[PDB]
Structure 1
């Protein structure tokens, strides 16, 4: 319930703070992702013009990790027999960011980028958002090669949204 459609492209309005499904306004979502925080949105009831306001911003490193992890978590929860909450930096997160780049940013990708080298320190400095695992747990049969691994501290995905005030 909660008036939420998790896994859909949802947008939160910065004025009334309520949640909306983008396509109910006919907003084009071909380059949108569920669990974005890099936008500002006003619904048509709140906005002075009586139309929607949808400002798309360029995702910073933290937003890319967060959206990647939210999406990976969601897919796993709803599609995996045995859902994972911890994901491989190299096998999961980077490939997600690569695949869905254009839904997060309009920056071109000339030559080799530096962002891959920097997401680990991005997540590691925000352990109130991100769970970090450099190595498998003592006793774990987890292959060392998939580490380090990352996850969301908060598993309530409904909590993800833009940093309004």
Structure 2
């Protein structure tokens, strides 16, 4: 499966295959791995024989999905001990904050930090939710709540064609 997880990859909405954006000289400086807020056609499938790339403003869900996918990929490849569950306050929100411009051109009291929990809590087939540490855990309360992706197969993440 010809994937390059961790690169900025883009799936073509017509042929449904995967590509890394670099392959085309697309500017990735404002891009992120594991985005879903775009529509892409490869140059084989698109009418003009050029690439098509339509970036959409990320909704709450896309922001969470991309933060979680990225935090989880980085933890899986860099940490001695991989985490799959990330803190809303210490991890998710600083991510969204930091890479804001990679997900939206909206200008920046932002109200989105209040709403990300509702967002993930209602998409239970996408997100894993722990309001509190497991009984018998040494995990400190301050770090909670915590969120993670139901589907740990990061290749499955893509636009909603």
Pick the TM interval, shorter chain.
over 0.9
1:39, distance to aligned residue in structure 2 (A): 0.1
2:83 partner SS: coil
CA distance in 2, matches of 1:33, 1:61: 16
Deviations 1:52-102 (A, max 9, x none): 000000000000000000000000000000000000000000000000000
Q: Secondary structure at the match of 1:40?
A: strand
* CA–CA distance in structure 1, aligned partners of residues 131 and 142 of structure 2: 11
Structure 1, gaps ≥5 residues long? none
Deviations 1:90-129 (A, max 9, x none): 00000000000000000000xx110000000000000100
How far apart are the structure 1 equivalents of 2:83 and 2:143? 13
Q: CA RMSD in A?
A: 0.2
Please state whether the residue corresponding to 2:110 is helix, strand or coil. Answer: coil
What is the DSSP-based 3-state SS (H/G/I as helix, E as strand, rest coil) of the residue aligned with 2:128?
Answer: strand
Using the size of structure 1 for normalisation, the TM-score is 0.97
Q: Aligned partners of 1:153, 1:62: CA distance in 2, in Å?
A: 14
Partners of 1:48 and 1:56 lie apart in 2 by 19
Q: Give unpaired runs (5+ residues) of structure 2.
A: none
SS in 2 for 1:118: helix
- How far the C-alpha of 1:20 sits from its partner, in A, is 0.3
- How far apart are residue 4 of structure 1 and its match? 0.2
Runs ≥4 in structure 1, deviation > 6 angstroms?
A: none
* Number of equivalenced pairs: 161
> Which residue of structure 1 aligns with residue 37 of structure 2?
38
1:63 match: 62
Query: After superposition, what is the alpha-carbon deviation per residue over 1:113-146, rounded to whole angstroms, capped at 9, x for unaligned?
Result: 1000000000000010000000000010000100
Distance 1:144 1:118 in 2: 21
| 1:45 CA drift (Å) | 0.1
Separation in 1 of the partners of 2:123 and 2:138? 27
Q: Distance in 2 between matches of 1:46 and 1:58?
A: 24
Q: Give the 3-state SS of the residue equivalent to 1:72 in structure 2.
A: helix
SS in 2 for 1:55: strand
